[PDB]
Structures are given as structure tokens and as C-alpha cells.
């Protein structure tokens, strides 16, 4: 579990999502596994505006923050799960690391901010979903 509070934004895991968010909603997009909804408060995170390759993500599984390389945004095939039918997901990194189901959530950083929410794993892979494109976050 996991999300980003940027502004009077809360940036969650599509499959994650509550009633709030969705009645709340500004925006989603299945495709990129992303749903932004509004909240009455200010949040404190900042996105980072940056193609920063290397950073740092929370593992929920092992209570670790780990240091990590991840790829440039890409549209990767993601396999059948419980939530969604085998499908390419775009916007996605992937690290080599430790990730589980209820890893999704967890925060990768950098120098800048906030890049990204987990979103996949297993087989020794964690992916992240990015937000660096979404400039209207700051806003
Ligand atoms: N974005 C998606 O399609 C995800 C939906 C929910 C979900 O569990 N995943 C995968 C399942 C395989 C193991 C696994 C480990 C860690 C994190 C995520 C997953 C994919
Ligand atoms: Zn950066």
C-alpha cells in the first residue's frame, strides 16, 4: 500500500483505489496502472522533473529502503494478475529487487523528489509506475 500527497492530489495504484478516490477522482488511466484523486489538505511530497536513472524505493516486505538503478519509462508486457488480463503497461521502470503484491505503493526517489509507486515485481524484478511526466501534479 502506498501514496504520493502532492498539492490537493493523492496519487495511488489504480488497482489500489478507495470509494473517495474514485468519486473524487481527477484522473486515470488503466493502462499506466494510475489513479489521481483531490483532498481538502495540502500534501508535502514533491515530484521530481528529472531522467535521473538512479534512486532509492520503499520495500514494504523487508521494511528496507533500497538504493536501486531502474530503466527510462517503457511499455512493458506485464502478466495476468488478479487485478488486471495479461496486458503492456506504458510508464514503467523496472530495478532489479525484492517486490511483492503489497509492495505496490511504496515510493522511489531521487535528488528531485518523488519519480514513481511500485507496480510490478517477482522473478527478482520491481517495477515502478512514473508520475515525472504529469507537470500538472505542481499545479
Ligand atoms: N501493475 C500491475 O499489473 C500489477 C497488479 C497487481 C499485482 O500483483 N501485480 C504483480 C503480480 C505478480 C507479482 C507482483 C509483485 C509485486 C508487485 C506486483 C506484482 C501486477
Ligand atoms: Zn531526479
Given amino acids: 500500500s502506498g501514496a ?18 474514485w468519486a473524487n477522482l ?5 493502462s499506466r496502472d494510475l489513479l489521481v484523486s483531490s483532498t481538502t489538505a495540502q500534501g508535502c511530497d514533491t515530484i521530481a522533473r528529472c531522467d535521473c536513472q538512479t534512486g532509492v524505493y520503499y520495500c514494504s516486505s523487508r521494511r528496507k529502503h533500497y538504493p536501486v ?9 506485464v502478466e495476468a494478475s488478479e487485478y488486471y488480463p495479461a496486458r503492456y503497461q506504458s510508464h514503467l521502470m523496472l530495478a532489479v529487487g525484492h517486490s511483492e503484491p503489497g509492495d505496490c505503493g511504496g515510493i522511489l526517489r531521487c535528488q528531485h523528489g518523488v519519480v514513481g509507486i511500485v507496480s510490478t515485481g517477482g522473478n527478482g524484478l520491481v517495477g515502478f509506475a ?8 505542481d499545479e
Fill in 4 to 21: 504520493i500527497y502532492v498539492g490537493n492530489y493523492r496519487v495511488v495504484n489504480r488497482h489500489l483505489a478507495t470509494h473517495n478516490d
Fill in 26 to 30: 481527477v484522473w486515470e488511466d488503466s
Fill in 69 to 77: 538503478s531502474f530503466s527510462k519509462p517503457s511499455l512493458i508486457f
Fill in 130 to 137: 512514473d508520475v515525472r511526466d504529469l507537470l500538472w501534479l
